[PDB]
Amino acid sequence: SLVLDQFGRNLTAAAMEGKLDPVIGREKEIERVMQVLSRRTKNNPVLIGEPGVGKTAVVEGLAQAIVHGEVPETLKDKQLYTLDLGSLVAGSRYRGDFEERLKKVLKEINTRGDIILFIDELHTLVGAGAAEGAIDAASILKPKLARGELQTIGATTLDEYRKYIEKDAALERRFQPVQVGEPTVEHTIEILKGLRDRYEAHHRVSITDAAMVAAATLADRYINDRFLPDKAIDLIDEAGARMRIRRMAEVDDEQIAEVLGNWTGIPVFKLTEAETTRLLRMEEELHKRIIGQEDAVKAVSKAIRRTRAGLKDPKRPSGSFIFAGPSGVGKTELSKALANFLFGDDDALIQIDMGEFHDRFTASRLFGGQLTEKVRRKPFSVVLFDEIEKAHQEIYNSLLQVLEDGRLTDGQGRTVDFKNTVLIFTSNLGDYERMKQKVNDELKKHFRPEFLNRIDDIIVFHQLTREEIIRMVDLMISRVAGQLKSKDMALVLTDAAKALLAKRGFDPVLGARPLRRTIQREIEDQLSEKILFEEVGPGQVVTVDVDNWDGDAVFTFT
Amino acid sequence: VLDQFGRNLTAAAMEGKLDPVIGREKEIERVMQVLSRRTKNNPVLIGEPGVGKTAVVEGLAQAIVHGEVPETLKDKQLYTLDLGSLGDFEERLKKVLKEINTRGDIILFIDELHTLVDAASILKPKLARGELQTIGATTLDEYRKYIEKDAALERRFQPVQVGEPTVEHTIEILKGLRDRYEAHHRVSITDAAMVAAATLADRYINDRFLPDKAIDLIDEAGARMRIRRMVAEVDDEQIAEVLGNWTGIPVFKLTEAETTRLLRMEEELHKRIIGQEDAVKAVSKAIRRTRAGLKDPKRPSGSFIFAGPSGVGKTELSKALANFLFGDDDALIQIDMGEFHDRFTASRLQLTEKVRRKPFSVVLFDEIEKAHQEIYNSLLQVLEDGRLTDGQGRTVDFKNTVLIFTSNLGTENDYERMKQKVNDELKKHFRPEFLNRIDDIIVFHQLTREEIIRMVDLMISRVAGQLKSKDMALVLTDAAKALLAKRGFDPVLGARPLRRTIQREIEDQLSEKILFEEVGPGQVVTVDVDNWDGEGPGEDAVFTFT
Ligand SMILES: Nc1ncnc2c1ncn2[C@@H]1O[C@H](COP(=O)(O)OP(=O)(O)O)[C@@H](O)[C@H]1O
Ligand SMILES: Nc1ncnc2c1ncn2[C@@H]1O[C@H](COP(=O)(O)OP(=O)(O)O)[C@@H](O)[C@H]1O
């Protein structure tokens, strides 16, 4: 009463006043908690669930049930109070100040006799004040909780409850777990529709139903750091705040798209649900960053189109393709373009090389895992598994069981979800039909036939045309000039210079992979030492020309 | 009543006492985002120290006074509360918060919000009641230590980040504060002096942080200009002498144009290291072409490969580079991957703390051949993005560190085929892509006889100086020098056995001889070799002392 207000807020008084957001569709959990509160002894329920699902919202709905009057006789006229243990632990720089405040609180509850306590952060009840063996909050609340005199409600998390409270059997037998469900998409839509009036009053903006649908279907499908529905309500509230500061109107999909793109860094035009427009123009979107391989681009575009269609059974990974051919043809930047188009991030792709990890000890590092950690952070990521030749049998067993099941069984005891990830196997093993037959019967004589039958599409990359090599050289001098424009370097590459760069930078036995080693050693070091020794300066065009070979050669940086 | 228990900000801008802010529009707009919300409407300002956590608050106050804020912040007054002005304290704080609730349009600024977490007995519930609109200002590490682990606080506080401004942004901040500081100190400041101050602040100062690290320099320079005067212009020389007084660094030509400092490497390194002048000029031209900013500025400033025997000059080259580039040998950090051969030691990548101690420091990653695979992955990540994801959770900047990989792999036409086998073995024993991200690969050369004797003379210079400390005299002949070089000749392992040969032959015998007390004080000691012709192995040759 006069001391409880200094540590918490009267939910019941605000419920009469009417400052509580209403809850819809959580009647089962409210009824279960009301069932537990109706017990004679051990009437303390603990709400078990992930943060951000609505446990405090469930308790507020219970308070709304208290004020309106749909509760039994033993919950009638019971003032609900909330307490935080952080406001009691803090200030205990002396022997027993925390215990003094807690005892004053309990004495006030005993005098009032009609208070149900909400003490969130229930996990610190064992550790508050002194250590776990000495006199703590648990050690003083235990002989009062078990006799059904102090009605308290907790709120914790699965792992939190399991490895704090379940260790203490005496506390476990005093708290009844009431599991709180993670709401579905329709539940979030219904809650947003219910809170439409409150946020219209607060923000003075009009909110549309399509905005709610888009907010929910992007919150659950880009954001994975937490769970529904705090993310969606935060999104719509921040969009309303954005309009409220930009006005000095009507909420549509553009505003929620731009605020979530601000959240994630993904560009706004990709967030709106014009996915058919994405798949219509995806070929030139992929081709502006890839070079050549027109048949490969067409094959992968049709494959991605049929896999995104969803007409297949929803028990399969979204993508599983074999990339074969000589090294350096462009499979890596092809995967990079895939990561850019499908998810809007170049770093959303996970790049692991499997040839270095041989034994089961490194297989523990693989799964049990960094791949597991990244697909738990964000399951909607393309995965790269290079060098499938050198793996050992347990790795093939794990890969094929992931393929056939869509699930991965790690050493951390979580079956991660791979229903939307894209599996890319860039293996250098092994005219187009002859190559398909060669890779097919080579895989049959090396792998199991089920691996070949399980894969979706096999894509073969041909050799790069010399003109396409010149095109890649032009592409790289574009970025070289872009990074050199700070000193006004306008570089001009003559055709003979292009031919010599293509000759020195491309090794047919090694593919195009040594390009990055060749290009800086043959161009950037020379221009850098010419800049340092003042042969050329800023504000002048550098036209490089090469002699002694027009179709040991010396280059001139004119 | 808050006037005697706190300091106003919106009413402080009436007199113009608050300093102007420059270029903080994005952070102020994010604060505008957060303050105009119904849930999580109290922003907390996360920033590394000395950046302007308060400066955005005076910027918001100036925006409120000038009138570029939405309707919810009309007629909002900002108050900073002081705990010094606050039984009686509890009721005073209670009546202050009740007056805030009664007024209804007072927004509070509290710095170091983790200190609230003996005022927690008052604010914690009535903040939960929602009648305070508040902006917090806390460093990220106390945020993670106190607020993030307290689950009852994230329902009302939302994080916003205040990063380090760029150097041009700091120049603009100095340009903004020019009028105030010129008014107060009645001294004149040059724009070139300001840009030099920003650059040298980023260069020679580590403990303090931008942009306070430049503004304190400018105030200090103006103060010392006042001291030297009692037609005043603060210039680059003033900033250089401020840094010389501050960091204890000299000021003659080292706080100057960097091109002259980078073009003189050969003589100053040759002052310490011995020979290998081809590798010296190769690594000198490599660091010249890499550190000049001509590379992409989002990558490490250097990546070096010194293949060769251990302790035969590559470690000496590293020590000389540390002594030249930054003036100190202690910034050179010694990491060898021989000790980091297990995953538990590999996840330690003692590494973050000492490189955060001095970001402008060289690094040594020794024996990369026996490094772990997770070490390979981390080095590949560092080479690719130029950053690092530590266990603490901050990106350690590598715009400034140069990478040195000292390895014993592979150990002029003979040296040509040695370089051929070095590149072949980095192609096969290592992956090609790891060495593809390396600026240059240079291989050391085996020592010649003159190189060995100029090891020998400076090796014996230590004991010669010790003898001069006792007023002795040491003289060596050329025949004894040649024999002593031949005894220590071990090309497989290098110059380390030369230390042992010197120790067993010269120093030990002379330490016994000075105790024998016949060639002690007042006589020059001259070593000589007899019973030796000049070609023999030296088995019949005995050192003699005169
Ligand atoms: N069914 C619901 N009805 C009303 N509000 C809800 C519902 N589910 C979630 N919320 C909102 O989600 C936010 C987080 O819920 P809350 O239980 O208070 O904290 P947490 O779920 O993070 O423990 C609250 O602001 C609440 O208003
Ligand atoms: N953009 C800016 N414009 C003007 N002044 C600035 C700017 N950024 C920082 N400052 C000045 O630099 C000083 C640094 O303040 P700081 O110590 O970071 O505050 P806090 O202690 O709250 O973190 C401030 O007093 C401010 O006047």
Side-chain angles (χ1 to χ4, degrees):
Chain A
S1 177
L2 276 296
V3 65
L4 271 297
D5 295 354
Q6 282 77 10
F7 290 129
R9 177 169 59 88
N10 195 351
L11 287 200
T12 314
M16 283 74 75
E17 172 194 17
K19 299 286 98 175
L20 277 299
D21 59 80
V23 57
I24 297 169
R26 296 214 72 90
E27 293 295 327
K28 187 41 196 190
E29 311 315 344
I30 298 175
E31 280 301 328
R32 172 79 172 136
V33 176
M34 271 155 88
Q35 267 176 34
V36 182
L37 266 289
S38 297
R39 302 237 300 280
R40 165 168 176 273
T41 63
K42 283 82 68 179
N43 49 6
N44 302 313
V46 59
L47 312 182
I48 311 299
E50 292 316 278
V53 298
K55 297 148 276 192
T56 295
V58 168
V59 176
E60 293 179 353
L62 183 138
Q64 292 178 176
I66 294 307
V67 57
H68 292 167
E70 58 270 19
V71 307
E73 200 57 59
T74 182
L75 281 72
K76 261 148 190 160
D77 205 2
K78 288 259 198 86
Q79 299 286 320
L80 197 74
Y81 278 166
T82 61
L83 315 175
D84 52 348
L85 283 180
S87 184
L88 314 172
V89 172
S92 179
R93 310 291 301 128
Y94 280 168
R95 197 205 288 237
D97 281 330
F98 156 71
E99 311 155 20
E100 195 289 326
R101 305 206 276 276
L102 191 146
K103 185 48 68 193
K104 189 68 152 294
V105 168
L106 265 67
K107 187 176 75 68
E108 189 65 33
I109 299 306
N110 194 2
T111 52
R112 285 269 297 230
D114 51 354
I115 308 298
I116 313 170
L117 282 71
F118 181 76
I119 61 171
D120 207 355
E121 269 172 321
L122 198 74
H123 65 279
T124 61
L125 203 69
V126 65
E132 55 94 20
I135 296 170
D136 47 50
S139 179
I140 188 167
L141 285 191
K142 273 158 61 174
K144 188 63 65 68
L145 285 184
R147 291 278 160 280
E149 188 67 28
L150 177 70
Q151 314 94 339
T152 190
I153 305 180
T156 43
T157 313
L158 271 193
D159 193 18
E160 183 179 1
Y161 177 81
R162 202 153 282 101
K163 65 164 282 313
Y164 301 149
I165 282 179
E166 290 255 30
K167 192 52 73 195
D168 195 328
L171 285 172
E172 192 295 339
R173 64 134 278 186
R174 285 178 175 84
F175 280 97
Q176 279 67 44
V178 173
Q179 293 179 356
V180 64
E182 191 273 332
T184 66
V185 181
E186 294 85 4
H187 297 157
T188 61
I189 295 299
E190 185 37 78
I191 298 314
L192 288 176
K193 181 64 71 178
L195 295 200
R196 183 178 178 180
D197 198 358
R198 298 291 183 117
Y199 288 167
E200 202 285 312
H202 185 260
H203 282 350
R204 185 62 178 84
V205 292
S206 277
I207 301 169
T208 63
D209 198 341
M212 272 156 207
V213 169
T217 199
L218 277 296
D220 55 10
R221 189 268 298 165
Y222 287 4
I223 297 89
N224 295 115
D225 303 356
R226 54 194 179 277
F227 312 91
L228 292 172
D230 63 351
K231 49 180 73 176
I233 190 167
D234 202 337
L235 271 165
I236 182 178
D237 185 72
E238 187 175 0
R242 187 150 316 188
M243 271 156 167
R244 200 161 171 87
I245 76 158
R246 175 230 42 72
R247 199 165 36 187
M248 295 298 102
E250 291 86 4
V251 176
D252 302 77
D253 297 336
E254 308 313 285
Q255 325 283 297
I256 190 66
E258 68 184 1
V259 67
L260 198 153
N262 190 359
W263 270 18
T264 49
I266 309 171
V268 181
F269 85 108
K270 190 176 283 190
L271 271 78
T272 178
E273 294 96 309
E275 202 270 330
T276 184
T277 78
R278 317 281 161 72
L279 56 90
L280 294 174
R281 64 202 198 236
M282 71 165 298
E283 308 94 16
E284 61 267 22
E285 275 184 279
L286 191 144
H287 212 181
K288 72 184 184 293
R289 302 209 258 270
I290 205 64
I291 176 61
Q293 299 294 339
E294 39 263 37
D295 57 355
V297 172
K298 288 183 285 161
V300 73
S301 57
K302 275 73 176 175
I304 288 156
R305 258 188 294 272
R306 46 182 158 77
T307 47
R308 286 176 297 175
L311 282 72
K312 62 163 200 212
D313 304 351
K315 324 286 176 175
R316 204 171 328 286
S318 66
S320 300
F321 314 119
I322 296 293
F323 287 167
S327 186
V329 289
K331 53 187 74 176
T332 299
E333 51 264 29
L334 174 61
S335 58
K336 260 71 175 176
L338 294 174
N340 280 309
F341 165 69
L342 277 296
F343 309 120
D345 294 332
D346 204 6
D347 74 313
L349 181 163
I350 179 166
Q351 204 275 340
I352 190 66
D353 198 350
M354 183 179 72
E356 289 85 4
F357 285 167
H358 283 165
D359 56 351
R360 290 221 298 190
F361 297 147
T362 66
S364 80
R365 178 65 183 272
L366 282 169
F367 39 92
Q370 54 93 32
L371 163 70
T372 300
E373 184 66 30
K374 204 184 274 206
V375 305
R376 281 262 65 79
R377 281 214 307 278
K378 47 183 295 295
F380 300 155
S381 176
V382 58
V383 64
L384 182 62
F385 263 119
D386 200 288
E387 192 67 28
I388 73 181
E389 301 88 0
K390 194 179 289 293
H392 191 272
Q393 289 280 353
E394 59 275 57
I395 309 300
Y396 304 102
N397 294 320
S398 48
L399 186 64
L400 276 296
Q401 70 91 23
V402 175
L403 285 172
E404 68 187 2
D405 221 329
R407 298 285 75 78
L408 191 148
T409 47
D410 60 356
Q412 296 301 94
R414 324 201 181 61
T415 80
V416 295
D417 185 74
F418 290 165
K419 83 194 174 324
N420 194 1
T421 188
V422 178
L423 282 80
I424 294 305
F425 313 150
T426 55
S427 169
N428 290 318
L429 61 83
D431 198 7
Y432 64 93
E433 178 62 43
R434 188 270 299 164
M435 192 65 148
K436 288 174 172 184
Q437 287 316 110
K438 195 196 71 185
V439 300
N440 276 308
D441 63 0
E442 195 271 345
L443 285 160
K444 287 292 181 67
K445 66 96 175 179
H446 187 273
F447 287 73
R448 288 191 293 270
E450 190 257 323
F451 180 77
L452 285 90
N453 291 117
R454 186 55 179 79
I455 205 70
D456 293 331
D457 208 331
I458 60 170
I459 301 100
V460 177
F461 310 133
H462 57 64
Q463 63 95 31
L464 304 173
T465 300
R466 314 284 87 79
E467 193 270 331
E468 298 292 76
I469 297 169
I470 297 169
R471 186 52 254 182
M472 294 182 286
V473 161
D474 189 359
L475 288 171
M476 71 65 77
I477 65 170
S478 73
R479 276 90 69 190
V480 164
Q483 85 199 70
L484 281 177
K485 268 308 169 286
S486 297
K487 303 162 288 320
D488 303 62
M489 294 298 102
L491 58 91
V492 176
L493 198 63
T494 66
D495 185 74
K498 306 218 209 282
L500 269 295
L501 293 187
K503 185 177 180 180
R504 300 286 220 205
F506 185 43
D507 198 0
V509 289
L510 311 178
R513 290 293 177 90
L515 64 86
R516 198 263 177 193
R517 153 73 43 211
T518 51
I519 57 172
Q520 65 101 17
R521 288 292 292 269
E522 73 190 357
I523 289 304
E524 193 275 332
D525 206 344
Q526 280 81 359
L527 65 90
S528 299
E529 59 91 15
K530 287 180 177 67
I531 282 183
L532 290 164
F533 298 150
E534 301 309 309
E535 280 84 4
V536 75
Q540 291 91 21
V541 289
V542 295
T543 62
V544 288
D545 190 359
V546 60
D547 293 331
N548 301 63
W549 205 90
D550 292 348
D552 60 335
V554 61
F555 35 81
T556 69
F557 275 52
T558 69
Chain B
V1 297
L2 311 93
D3 52 300
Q4 195 263 327
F5 284 161
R7 189 45 190 109
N8 197 317
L9 294 174
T10 309
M14 185 180 288
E15 273 66 37
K17 300 186 182 299
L18 302 179
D19 62 358
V21 77
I22 301 99
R24 283 307 190 186
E25 269 318 290
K26 298 287 106 177
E27 298 176 356
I28 289 164
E29 279 320 310
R30 272 292 296 136
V31 167
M32 281 315 327
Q33 288 292 108
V34 181
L35 289 176
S36 286
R37 298 182 37 167
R38 190 167 178 267
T39 54
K40 309 202 197 219
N41 51 3
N42 286 320
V44 54
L45 295 162
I46 297 89
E48 191 215 330
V51 169
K53 295 181 177 68
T54 183
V56 296
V57 185
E58 292 84 4
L60 183 63
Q62 291 174 140
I64 281 172
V65 164
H66 287 344
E68 306 97 325
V69 298
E71 293 311 281
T72 61
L73 282 72
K74 299 288 95 175
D75 205 347
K76 284 295 199 226
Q77 293 181 357
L78 277 296
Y79 284 69
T80 66
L81 73 165
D82 44 351
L83 279 75
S85 175
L86 298 172
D88 307 279
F89 155 74
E90 295 90 317
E91 63 96 12
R92 273 150 65 155
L93 190 59
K94 179 176 173 66
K95 84 177 191 293
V96 175
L97 281 71
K98 302 303 131 173
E99 211 282 330
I100 297 169
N101 186 20
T102 300
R103 181 135 152 76
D105 54 354
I106 294 300
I107 306 186
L108 276 296
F109 182 34
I110 188 167
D111 49 348
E112 311 180 319
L113 183 63
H114 65 279
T115 55
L116 182 61
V117 193
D118 46 45
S121 297
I122 304 300
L123 280 74
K124 293 293 196 296
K126 189 269 183 182
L127 271 293
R129 292 179 179 87
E131 305 100 12
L132 277 296
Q133 191 174 3
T134 318
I135 295 93
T138 313
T139 307
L140 60 88
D141 58 355
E142 293 84 4
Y143 184 15
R144 304 152 53 254
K145 183 65 174 67
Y146 280 84
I147 283 284
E148 293 179 354
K149 296 155 59 165
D150 190 358
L153 271 295
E154 294 87 2
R155 320 200 200 283
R156 206 156 54 257
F157 303 70
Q158 193 275 332
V160 60
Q161 291 84 15
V162 179
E164 295 287 337
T166 187
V167 59
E168 191 263 3
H169 212 307
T170 59
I171 294 157
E172 208 51 53
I173 291 169
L174 273 295
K175 201 54 69 209
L177 271 298
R178 180 178 68 187
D179 70 326
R180 314 212 63 102
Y181 275 116
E182 284 187 315
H184 193 197
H185 287 286
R186 73 280 191 190
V187 69
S188 314
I189 309 170
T190 303
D191 306 336
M194 293 180 183
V195 61
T199 54
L200 298 172
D202 186 74
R203 163 72 198 84
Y204 295 116
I205 307 171
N206 195 9
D207 206 6
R208 283 186 253 174
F209 289 146
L210 291 172
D212 211 322
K213 161 172 64 183
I215 202 68
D216 63 358
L217 281 194
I218 291 295
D219 211 350
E220 190 71 24
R224 72 179 298 163
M225 173 56 257
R226 279 312 309 296
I227 297 300
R228 72 199 307 112
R229 194 131 181 200
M230 183 177 177
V231 294
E233 186 71 30
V234 173
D235 290 330
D236 300 334
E237 300 97 346
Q238 311 269 29
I239 295 296
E241 71 187 59
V242 175
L243 274 296
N245 265 349
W246 273 33
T247 63
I249 205 76
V251 299
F252 55 102
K253 303 311 294 202
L254 62 85
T255 313
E256 275 312 314
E258 91 280 355
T259 58
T260 59
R261 306 280 79 76
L262 55 89
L263 64 90
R264 55 149 189 183
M265 281 145 187
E266 58 274 15
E267 63 269 19
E268 56 197 323
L269 278 71
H270 286 163
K271 183 173 72 68
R272 279 91 69 191
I273 63 170
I274 296 93
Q276 303 292 318
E277 69 274 62
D278 48 355
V280 160
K281 74 214 194 205
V283 74
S284 80
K285 77 172 59 67
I287 190 62
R288 280 195 196 87
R289 59 101 168 174
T290 49
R291 85 181 302 279
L294 317 167
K295 291 289 186 181
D296 171 348
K298 290 310 282 171
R299 328 175 74 65
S301 52
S303 61
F304 290 157
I305 293 294
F306 310 140
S310 178
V312 309
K314 63 174 180 66
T315 74
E316 310 165 18
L317 188 53
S318 68
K319 295 306 286 298
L321 192 43
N323 207 351
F324 152 71
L325 187 58
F326 302 108
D328 62 357
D329 291 332
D330 72 281
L332 178 138
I333 54 169
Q334 179 58 254
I335 301 299
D336 44 346
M337 308 329 290
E339 321 171 321
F340 292 166
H341 195 72
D342 291 331
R343 183 193 159 155
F344 268 115
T345 56
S347 66
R348 196 63 60 86
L349 183 141
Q350 51 192 106
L351 188 138
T352 295
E353 184 262 348
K354 64 182 181 293
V355 70
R356 196 206 40 81
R357 180 66 62 193
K358 180 52 75 183
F360 292 167
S361 51
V362 294
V363 297
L364 294 179
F365 283 10
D366 195 1
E367 200 79 9
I368 63 176
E369 297 97 326
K370 303 311 280 173
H372 201 257
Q373 184 61 42
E374 191 206 40
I375 301 299
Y376 292 166
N377 290 318
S378 55
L379 294 174
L380 277 191
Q381 177 261 333
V382 167
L383 286 172
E384 289 329 293
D385 53 39
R387 324 282 86 87
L388 188 152
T389 318
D390 56 353
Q392 193 194 320
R394 64 177 296 275
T395 61
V396 181
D397 56 28
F398 305 146
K399 314 297 192 298
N400 59 6
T401 76
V402 294
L403 277 296
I404 297 92
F405 291 164
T406 61
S407 61
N408 298 116
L409 56 92
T411 43
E412 193 44 76
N413 290 319
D414 291 331
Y415 288 115
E416 267 308 306
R417 65 134 178 84
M418 294 299 291
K419 290 180 50 160
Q420 279 318 299
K421 75 183 291 293
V422 167
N423 63 61
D424 197 3
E425 81 197 75
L426 62 86
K427 278 156 183 42
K428 56 170 188 296
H429 185 281
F430 294 99
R431 60 217 166 279
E433 191 275 331
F434 179 69
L435 277 296
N436 164 80
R437 268 288 300 105
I438 299 303
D439 294 336
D440 65 322
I441 296 90
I442 186 64
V443 194
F444 278 70
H445 282 201
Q446 275 71 242
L447 278 76
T448 81
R449 311 285 83 77
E450 50 261 53
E451 310 310 309
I452 303 179
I453 69 171
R454 65 184 45 250
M455 301 265 158
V456 166
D457 59 359
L458 58 83
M459 185 64 72
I460 303 174
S461 304
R462 188 275 331 264
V463 71
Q466 287 183 356
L467 294 174
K468 302 314 151 274
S469 174
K470 311 222 285 181
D471 287 302
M472 295 298 102
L474 183 49
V475 165
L476 278 79
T477 186
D478 62 358
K481 189 159 197 187
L483 182 64
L484 184 59
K486 187 173 182 179
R487 184 161 324 260
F489 173 74
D490 190 358
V492 176
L493 188 153
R496 293 324 191 194
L498 190 150
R499 178 70 274 172
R500 267 187 268 204
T501 57
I502 291 281
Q503 184 58 260
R504 66 207 208 193
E505 297 271 45
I506 292 293
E507 208 187 70
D508 203 353
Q509 194 145 58
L510 192 150
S511 68
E512 190 276 331
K513 200 74 161 59
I514 187 168
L515 300 189
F516 189 75
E517 191 66 28
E518 62 86 20
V519 69
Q523 184 60 41
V524 56
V525 162
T526 300
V527 72
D528 208 357
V529 161
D530 55 344
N531 307 66
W532 181 65
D533 49 348
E535 175 77 11
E539 311 307 304
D540 53 353
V542 182
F543 284 78
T544 48
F545 296 86
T546 73

